[PDB]
Write a protein that binds this ligand. Sequence first.
Ligand SMILES: COc1cccc(CNCCS(=O)(=O)O)c1
Length: 658
Amino acid sequence: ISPIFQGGSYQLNNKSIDISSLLLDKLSGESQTVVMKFKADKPNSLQALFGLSNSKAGFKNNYFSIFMRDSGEIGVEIRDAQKGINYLFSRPASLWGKHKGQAVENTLVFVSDSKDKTYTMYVNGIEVFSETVDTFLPISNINGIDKATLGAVNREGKEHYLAKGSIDEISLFNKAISDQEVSTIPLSNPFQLIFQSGDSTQANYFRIPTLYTLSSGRVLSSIDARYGGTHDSKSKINIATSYSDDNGKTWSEPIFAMKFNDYEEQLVYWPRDNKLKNSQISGSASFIDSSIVEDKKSGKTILLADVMPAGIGNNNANKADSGFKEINGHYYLKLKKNGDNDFRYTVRENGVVYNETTNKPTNYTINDKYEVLEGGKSLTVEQYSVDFDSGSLRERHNGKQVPMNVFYKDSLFKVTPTNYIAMTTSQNRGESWEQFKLLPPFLGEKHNGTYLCPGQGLALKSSNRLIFATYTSGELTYLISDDSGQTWKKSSASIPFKNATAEAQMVELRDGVIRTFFRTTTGKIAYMTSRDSGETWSKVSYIDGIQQTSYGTQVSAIKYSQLIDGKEAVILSTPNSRSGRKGGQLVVGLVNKEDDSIDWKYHYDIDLPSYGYAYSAITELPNHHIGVLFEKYDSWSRNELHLSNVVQYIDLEINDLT
Ligand SMILES: COc1cccc(CNCCS(=O)(=O)O)c1
């Protein structure tokens, strides 16, 4: 079905374009679709792209607008004072500005549907809001509309919300086009999605991306599949993975590397209003923060993640307890039974549940999947589902039985409410994953477990050594295996911080020489160096030339395989900003062989300084391109919680960076 208006190549240079004569008399009926392809690489703070207004005296609040902010937020207003209606729908972090130095053509589709009383906005193929109202307001039914305007809104004869940008194509339809028809509108996206809302994970949200290039050429990604909005644990979160066999061009349907069944995997639209946005799934077990490494010797892929029992996160995790008991220099997982006040059980060899008060064993065993068996028979619990039908979050039994797991709220036997580290392996490069195994405590019986640094582990090039960085109060705790992840030992490296989220990632500068880059609380990224393949660690130094916030952000890092400007090169990915998680950059550093110092020579801006960029994952693709999977939004900001499809993937070449 044809547009009632089609126009193109409009330059918005702080001067509105009047299209009233062309458009206004064409508008008919109560349903409309706006399709617009536009660039804005230097937007004003708040600017309107399109406006339909009553421009007369006394009617300044009678207008429809499509607007954007220099934060990347997109929205509309639909206002009519006579009707007492002032609608505003918007979503932060919905836009691109630039990619490889060039302004990005954003594709916006806005649907105003009088029959369903629903307003829906898509940007770049992503639905960013869909809102139904009791009292519908057709956009051309605003009392006294007499102006159609590009690049401003005409109110009382003046240009409000002047825009800087361009509208390369704009079309209007006297129909609410279907979601199907929307899907056929061609896009000019600079990015792709690996994980996305409605995929096999059925999580509506994703955080904490990782990337790793396997020896076969397959590129593997892992991620937090986050169900209860974007909240850290406590929530329901699983760890999902996807891989690409064609240098990141296409990606497999995700599968789970680590998951719990105590709560249903539900695709939920988590409330974003101030009253409810802190609603949190409070009774589910969860995983959080994954990291991947490949072992050259066995060929296995190893993935670790933090594990949280039901109701548990970092804020309420039992510090002062590892969750294990030491009996002979061996560690056993503690368990508490229904009705006891203390943990009077342990899980011994082969999974036998022992009673500790009487050193007498039980008729209960824990299988490989941490599920409870009584006399070899699988115990079950009823699953929970969540909903907001009542006007607040509700967590309730759904009639389905699932194996009873010791990390569950409803389990007969429960682990200590603290954080653990789990490991799984894959023998087929991410096509399937084993059942996870808990790592032992490394800092003692009465120390809670360390926190995994999300991203990559390190496989040393000249040995079989595998390292996963973790952090805790006062130190980085490196976990080291020389036997394909069968056994681990720790290597502690003190840092001058108490209670820092010291997320750390490593690069091997040359054989046996590791530089670790890490998040701090100082506004600068720190580093330390090992020259004995991780046995001992230097004092902490700081990078100048990159700014982070006081609270910091995860940083990703790789050793590039090729020389640049004749030198060994390292590439860092991080926001570069002392204000928020925005201004994403890749920073190319050249190693000085004299002293292993790094000269941070090239800074590549991923997108606008004002556009969001948070946790990130970088990998050198088999073709020597650079793959970047990153949170394209401010994942700290309390205004940008619970956004869908903001973790995105781009492909870059080194010449783009320099
Ligand atoms: C709250 O429970 C946690 C369990 C493991 C790790 C973490 C750290 N997540 C920090 C992310 S952010 O707030 O800096 O975006 C949190």
